[PDB]
């Protein structure tokens, strides 16, 4: 039924939400951002102020 | 006139206290609704029995199995409706804050008071205040009566704390036969029919109900053909309150507990519980109590196995088969992209008119009563103009008035609604506005509740009860740099308000909200439950949070006044996008960044405006866009089968704990104690 | 006056790096104002 | 000095991905 | 995507009204019969002026040029600049926007640059005068339009600015029953380019028309001279009648053709006056719309304005059609008393409205 | 180029609000000193 | 490293046993004294005053 | 003063000063009421703005007198008022959190 | 002519063109 198929796929969407929260967060997410801790050039790619 | 000034005084100050605030009301003066009472406690404290006596005392009509929304008729001209909530579940507690009007707050004598009674104390104060009558059960457990008179007032004044210093609890005595103390009861009976309403916004603004019975249509043959798979018809039989729920049958509805239905097709009843000027004025044109899942006479029904006990232009215009030069010429007997209307030529109109002969005749006592005259006025305007033809705009362009019975029946409800519902929730159907409807993103401000014990987190689950609908989202919290701009905090002001953003289903501007942390009672421990409260402000469909970054970067020759600094950059292209830029030191000294220094890659030179040393930490803020996750996750409450534990998700504590992970905490971040021995210069 | 204490909650300092630590003791903006003070003063006598 | 050809690489992407932007 | 309509049939008021009310609707077959078929591009112009003012809005045209599925968003609007492509004036590019005022988020401070008037569609001083005074009646407060420069067909380079201030919540409802007591005249004479003694000809031949009437009529004549009176050149008229103690008014202009006769112009417009308040009941004929909109999406509440049966005609049958498949509303035509003349009370009782964008 | 445009804009966007806040204190001084002192005024005599 | 790890996740364990042994046996909850007292925010305050 | 009563009720039309950066100041506590004996706008201050950020829109304030003694440093004078209760509660038991906010 | 010439526009309607020894 279609409870339980979308409640399937909300489980799928838990799951991800999951393991991404409690993973390592992203170089520039931190603060206090050195040159060695980042990937090279990014912040020539990217855009900030 | 020293006693008539006085007096004077005191009678302008009695004056202005008797004052408030205009406010429409859109319920009505002919068959206004049944009132609303919700008995509500702790789980053993005694709504049951209660409801049971207070039935059997004002309808003659004694009880077993009470169970379900049971309205009886009370006093000359008002419907009352009891519903028990069985507050276990923090979902019924919070539905029934929602709709109630009249809640008997049932409270326990020998403990004074719990968790629950306080939850939806807080629930009824943010979401729109009922009128609250405390009851203190539980009298017959005291055995010296000093020390009786000693909690009883004790009890009075943390209740008159709680809500306003004039709701008065009454005491009920003990249980004599099963049921409560005959004088008693009337003393209750009489302070609820004597208690006066107010009207609350959500009220006033929404179609809301709550459903009476319930009934599945389906063909049994397409249950065969299909195997008890296929979303049914629904039928749901109830009142009506709040305002006119407009007829033109396709609407939206929010069923709480389950989800956002529309309406298939409504139809109006005539209803089974009438007030005697209805049935006076009404018999006399032609020529008591209902609780219909529950048991009345001696007979409940069930699904199907009843149980007894032992024994012209407007429909020219609106006629949509016709074309428009039709409608005009029988009447008698284009594009609207263009603006100038179609004339006739300038010769005919000029002889038509050489006179002006068909126009020369069309030339030639406080402030709060008078808002209040205006509002009535337009009541009354409202009221005459339906009195011209009273039959089509009573059925049409009005909807069905506030206290009218109707059936509604909904399309494709989910069979596990249909399978395993109980009579003991309550469920309600609120409409919907146009607004509500939407997705975007919401932005609140809200504080962690003052009782409470944990700070709250970005990303961090909160399930919170907004309108209708209760669903979990990820909120992520905003202070504004001293009104510059959105910075992204990480906890909660813990005695403030702070901001807050997060996608969900819009709400009106103005809206009261609160958010609950877990609501599964598999996990409540002794801990309050209740977490944040809250306001939504605005609304839009994307906003630029973002979240300070600064690169860190150390000086390696320093000369006076100019200095070349490494590891912010690693290559000269990087700091050439970067360069002519602000900088500063950790102690305070600016600079500016100039030139990439080109025979090693990262370094550059800087010049600051004091000489730095080497001891320094040169830095660069810097603001990284941060955005929010599309997570939304209504509660489908009462689709599950325990109808408590809807386990959503985890917080980040728990998961950690789950999988058997650490705390991510770096070692140069917590601070120490710092002796500086004191300097002398040479 | 109108102020919570929690308003008043004194704010700690942090100290240098450890990869960092052999050039001692992170100046913050009171060391700095003793060092510049002090070259100020001898600057001027010396123009004098 | 193929890892020039490396860098030249690394160049000519980088200016790609800056001038795209 | 849900609600199909037919045909290019009123286009941007069907567009209105899906912005204001939340709907999502489906157009097609906009001449698709044709040898030309297609979407016009002053349509196309008109779309990308709704993306520009709201917010979170999906249109999506079929490739052919015939299907435009319209999703749309919340207003916020702002300050922004349009550049009306030189089929259609800037009259029939902010009359829609005139509309959607007064419910955005922040204020309306549009440029406009492009053709300034037309035969077809409203002028700067037809909406200045004609359409401002209803939602000036309606509880707006501060509207505004300037004119920085005034164009001319065919070349324009007009430019006005369009300024609303007032974000009221919800228009309030309007009571107009009695026919209004009309007291005052008067108009605007304007030229681009010609001779001061051809906008004196036009004013001598609307006071020609006039001279009957024992009301005051008082024509200002604005000419433009020098660099801000734009590159064509053009003549044209338009008149107002007021009522003083209520406020109301109405209103007829017309241009001058390359050639006409600016007496028989003056004399043109005057008879168009008159005839439309002949016409008239409180309400101009093609500010009927308007008020309509207004009075349907205006607060919870029986609404009432007087109209007359020589305005009810095919435009209006088919501007009340599609506010019931739009809103689901019924409009209920009550006959008025007075057994001299023919009017209709058209009662509307106004659904719940709001703005929900706005802040607090 | 962008440094031109930030520093301009960013400016430019001060000096206006300091204009705004400036005109809501004057008005306010302005209207409610009116009638503070024209209450005092009053109230000296009676 | 991992000695180091499980000595940290057991403590935690340990630690979180001490906090969440504050349950009660009976279903029935309580008021904390909190709010059972109801009062907040409020300076430090001194006993020779308590007398 | 405003009538003959020292408190007069009043509906918090708008707040002024909402984007006035530096906080706790003058401009940032004060409100404006319109009082709903005479229909007149007024005025009004707070305590800080922390309980400003309690009080919220068409709320029904209770205005009395401000009558503070001396001019401060960077004051707004003219305003002559200070909200003392809102809905009912009263701001300062809000602030110090005795009390829930009832709508 | 005149009118035109008049500056009635600069002087009022350049409202009408927006809003003891
Ligand atoms: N001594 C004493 N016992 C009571 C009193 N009220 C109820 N009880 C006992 O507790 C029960 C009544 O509570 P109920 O009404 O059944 O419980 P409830 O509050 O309806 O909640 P549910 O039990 O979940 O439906 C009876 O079995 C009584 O014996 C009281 O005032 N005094």
């Not at chain 2, 004091?610 to 409450?637: A, E, H, Q």
């Not at chain 2, 705390?663 to 120490?672: E, F, G, V």
């Not at chain 3, 001692?24 to 003063?41: N, P």
């Not at chain 5, 309030?172 to 304007?190: F, K, L, N």
């Given at each position: ?49 | ?682 | ?48 | ?21 | ?29 906009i001449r698709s019969g044709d040898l030309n078929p297609g979407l016009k591009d002053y349509e196309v112009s008109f779309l990308r002026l709704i993306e520009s003012v709201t917010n979170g809005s999906v249109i999506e045209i079929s490739y052919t040029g015939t299907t435009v599925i319209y999703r749309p968003g919340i207003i916020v609007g702002g300050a922004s600049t349009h550049i009306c492509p030189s089929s259609k004036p800037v009259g029939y590019f902010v009359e829609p926007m005139l509309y959607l005022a007064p419910f955005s988020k922040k204020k309306f401070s549009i440029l406009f640059k492009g053709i300034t008037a037309s035969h077809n569609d409203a002028g700067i001083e037809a909406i200045k005068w004609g359409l401002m005074p209803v939602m000036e009646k309606f509880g707006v407060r501060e509207c505004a339009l300037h004119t920085l420069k005034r164009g001319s067909p065919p070349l324009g380079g007009g430019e006005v600015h369009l300024v609303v201030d007032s974000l009221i919540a919800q228009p309030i409802t309007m009571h107009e029953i009695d026919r209004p007591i009309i007291s005052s005249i008067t108009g605007v004479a304007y030229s681009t380019r010609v001779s001061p003694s051809l906008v004196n000809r036009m004013i001598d031949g609307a006071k020609k028309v006039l001279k009957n009437l024992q009301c005051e009529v008082n024509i200002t ?140 | ?46 | ?51 | ?89 009263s701001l300062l038991a809000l602030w110090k959190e005795k009390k829930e906010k009832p709508r | 002519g005149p009118s035109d010439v008049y500056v009635p526009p600069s002087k009022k309607t350049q409202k009408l063109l927006r809003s003891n020894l």
């Amino acid at each position: 039924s279609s409870f339980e198929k979308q409640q399937i796929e909300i489980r799928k969407q838990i799951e991800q939400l999951e393991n991404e929260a409690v993973a390592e967060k992203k170089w520039s997410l931190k603060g206090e951002v050195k040159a060695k801790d980042r990937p090279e050039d990014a912040l020539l790619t990217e855009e900030l102020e | 006139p020293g006693k008539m000034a006085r007096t004077m005084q005191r009678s302008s100050d009695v004056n202005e206290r008797k004052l408030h605030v205009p406010m429409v009301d859109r319920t009505p003066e002919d068959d206004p609704p049944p009132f609303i009472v919700a008995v509500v406690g702790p789980p053993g404290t005694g709504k049951t029995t209660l409801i049971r006596s207070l039935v059997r005392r004002m309808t003659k009509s004694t009880l077993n199995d009470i169970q379900g929304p049971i309205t009886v008729v009370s006093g000359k001209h008002r419907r009352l409706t009891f519903l028990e909530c069985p507050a276990d579940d923090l979902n019924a507690m919070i539905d029934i804050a929602k709709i109630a009007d009249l809640v008997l707050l049932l409270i326990d004598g020998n403990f004074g008071f719990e968790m629950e009674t306080m939850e939806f104390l807080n629930i009824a104060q943010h979401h729109g205040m009922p009128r609250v009558l405390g009851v203190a059960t539980h009298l017959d457990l005291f055995k010296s009566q000093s020390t009786l008179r000693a909690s009883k007032k004790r009890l009075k004044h943390r209740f008159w704390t709680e809500v306003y210093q004039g709701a008065k609890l009454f005491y009920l005595s003990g249980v004599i036969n099963g049921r409560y103390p005959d004088r008693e009861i009337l003393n209750l009976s009489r302070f609820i029919s004597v208690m006066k309403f107010r009207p609350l916004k959500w009220r006033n603004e929404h179609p809301y109900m709550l459903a009476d019975r319930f009934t599945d249509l389906t063909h049994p043959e397409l249950i065969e053909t299909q195997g008890l798979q296929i979303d049914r018809k629904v039928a749901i039989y109830g009142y009506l309150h709040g305002t006119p729920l407009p007829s033109a049958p396709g609407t939206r509805v929010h069923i709480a507990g389950v989800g956002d239905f529309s309406v298939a097709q409504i139809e109006k009843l005539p209803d089974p519980c009438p007030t005697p000027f209805y049935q006076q004025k009404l018999d006399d044109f032609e020529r008591l109590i209902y609780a219909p899942m529950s048991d009345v006479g001696g007979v409940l029904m069930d699904k199907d196995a009843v149980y007894i006990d032992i024994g012209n232009i407007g429909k020219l215009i609106y006629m949509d088969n016709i074309s428009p030069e039709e409608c005009i010429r029988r009447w008698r007997g284009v594009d609207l992209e263009k603006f100038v209307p179609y004339f006739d030529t300038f010769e005919k109109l000029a002889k038509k008119w050489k006179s002006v002969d068909a126009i020369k005749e069309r030339f030639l006592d406080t402030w709060y009563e008078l808002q209040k005259a205006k509002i009535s006025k337009q009541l009354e305007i409202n009221n005459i103009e339906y009195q011209e033809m009273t039959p089509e705009q009573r059925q049409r362009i009005e909807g069905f008035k506030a206290g009218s019975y109707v059936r509604i029946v909904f399309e494709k409800v989910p069979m596990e609604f249909v399978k395993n519902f109980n009579p003991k929730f309550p469920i309600v159907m609120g409409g919907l506005l146009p607004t509500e409807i939407k997705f975007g993103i919401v932005k609140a401000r809200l504080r962690r509740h003052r009782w409470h014990k944990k700070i709250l987190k970005t990303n961090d689950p909160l399930v919170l009860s907004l309108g209708w609908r209760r669903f979990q989202t990820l909120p992520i919290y905003t202070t504004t740099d001293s009104r510059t701009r959105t910075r992204m905090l990480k906890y909660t002001p813990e005695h403030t308000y702070c901001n807050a953003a997060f996608y969900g289903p819009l709400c009106s501007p103005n809206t009261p909200f609160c958010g609950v942390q877990i609501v599964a009672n598999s996990d409540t421990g002794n801990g309050f439950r209740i977490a944040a409260t809250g306001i939504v402000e605005e609304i839009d469909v994307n906003i630029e949070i973002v979240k300070k970054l600064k690169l860190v970067g150390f000086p390696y020759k320093i000369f006076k006044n100019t200095a070349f600094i490494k590891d912010m950059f690693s290559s000269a292209m990087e700091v050439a996008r970067f360069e002519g830029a602000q900088i500063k030191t950790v102690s305070g000294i600016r600079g500016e960044i100039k030139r990439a220094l080109s025979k090693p890659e990262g370094h550059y030179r800087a010049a600051f405006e004091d000489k730095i040393l080497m001891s320094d930490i040169v830095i660069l803020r810097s603001w990284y866009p941060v955005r929010v996750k599309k997570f939304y996750n209504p509660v489908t409450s009462l689709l599950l089968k325990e109808k408590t534990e809807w386990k959503g998700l985890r917080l980040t504590g728990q998961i950690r704990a789950a999988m058997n992970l650490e705390t991510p905490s770096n070692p140069d971040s917590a601070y120490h104690k710092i002796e500086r021995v004191e300097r002398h210069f040479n | 006056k109108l102020v919570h204490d929690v308003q008043k909650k004194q704010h700690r300092e942090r100290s240098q790096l450890t990869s960092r630590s052999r050039y001692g003791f992170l100046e913050k903006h009171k060391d700095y104002v003793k060092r510049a003070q002090d070259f100020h003063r001898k600057q001027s006598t010396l123009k004098v | 000095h193929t890892l020039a050809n490396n860098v030249e690489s690394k160049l000519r992407d980088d200016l790609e991905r800056l001038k795209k932007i | 995507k849900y609600t199909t309509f037919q045909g290019s049939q009123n286009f941007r008021l069907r567009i209105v009204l899906a912005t204001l009310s939340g709907k999502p609707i489906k157009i097609e077959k906009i001449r698709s019969g044709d040898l030309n078929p297609g979407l016009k591009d002053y349509e196309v112009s008109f779309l990308r002026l709704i993306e520009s003012v709201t917010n979170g809005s999906v249109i999506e045209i079929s490739y052919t040029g015939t299907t435009v599925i319209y999703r749309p968003g919340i207003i916020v609007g702002g300050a922004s600049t349009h550049i009306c492509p030189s089929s259609k004036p800037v009259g029939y590019f902010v009359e829609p926007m005139l509309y959607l005022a007064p419910f955005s988020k922040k204020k309306f401070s549009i440029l406009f640059k492009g053709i300034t008037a037309s035969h077809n569609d409203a002028g700067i001083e037809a909406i200045k005068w004609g359409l401002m005074p209803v939602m000036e009646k309606f509880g707006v407060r501060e509207c505004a339009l300037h004119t920085l420069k005034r164009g001319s067909p065919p070349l324009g380079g007009g430019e006005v600015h369009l300024v609303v201030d007032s974000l009221i919540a919800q228009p309030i409802t309007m009571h107009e029953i009695d026919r209004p007591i009309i007291s005052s005249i008067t108009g605007v004479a304007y030229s681009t380019r010609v001779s001061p003694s051809l906008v004196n000809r036009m004013i001598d031949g609307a006071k020609k028309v006039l001279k009957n009437l024992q009301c005051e009529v008082n024509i200002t004549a604005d000419v433009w001279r020098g660099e801000n009176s734009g590159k064509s050149p053009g003549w044209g008229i338009t008149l107002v009648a007021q009522s003083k103690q209520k406020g109301w008014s109405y209103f007829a202009e017309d241009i001058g053709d390359a050639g006409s006769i600016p007496e028989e112009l003056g004399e043109k417009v005057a008879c168009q006056l008159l005839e439309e308040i002949s016409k008239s009941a409180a309400v101009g004929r093609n500010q009927l719309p308007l008020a309509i909109v207004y009075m349907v999406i205006g607060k919870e509440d029986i609404g009432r304005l007087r109209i007359n049966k020589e305005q009810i005609d095919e435009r209006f049958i088919i501007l009340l059609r599609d506010i019931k498949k739009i809103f689901n509303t019924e409009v209920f035509l009550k006959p008025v008393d007075e057994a001299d003349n023919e009017d209709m009370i058209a009662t509307i009782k106004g659904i719940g409205f709001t703005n929900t964008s706005k802040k607090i | 180029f962008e440094a031109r445009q930030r520093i301009e804009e960013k400016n430019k966007e001060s000096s206006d609000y300091h204009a705004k806040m400036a005109h809501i204190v004057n008005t306010i001084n302005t209207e409610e000193g009116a009638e503070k002192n024209k209450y005092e005024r009053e109230r000296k005599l009676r | 490293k991992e000695a180091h790890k499980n000595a940290v996740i057991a403590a935690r364990e340990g630690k979180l046993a001490e906090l969440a042994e504050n349950v009660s046996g009976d279903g029935k909850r309580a008021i904390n004294y909190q709010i059972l007292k109801n009062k907040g925010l409020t300076p430090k305050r001194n006993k020779d005053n308590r007398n | 003063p405003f009538g003959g009563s020292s408190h007069a009720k009043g509906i918090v039309l708008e707040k002024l000063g909402i984007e006035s950066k530096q906080p706790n100041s003058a401009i940032r506590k004060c409100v404006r009421v319109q009082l709903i004996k005479n229909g007149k706008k007024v005025t009004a201050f707070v305590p800080n703005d922390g309980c400003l950020n309690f009080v919220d829109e068409n709320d029904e304030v209770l205005l009395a007198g401000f009558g503070r003694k001396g001019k401060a440093k960077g004051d707004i004078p003219g305003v002559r008022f200070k909200v003392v209760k809102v809905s009912g509660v009263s701001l300062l038991a809000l602030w110090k959190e005795k009390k829930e906010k009832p709508r | 002519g005149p009118s035109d010439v008049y500056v009635p526009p600069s002087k009022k309607t350049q409202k009408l063109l927006r809003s003891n020894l």
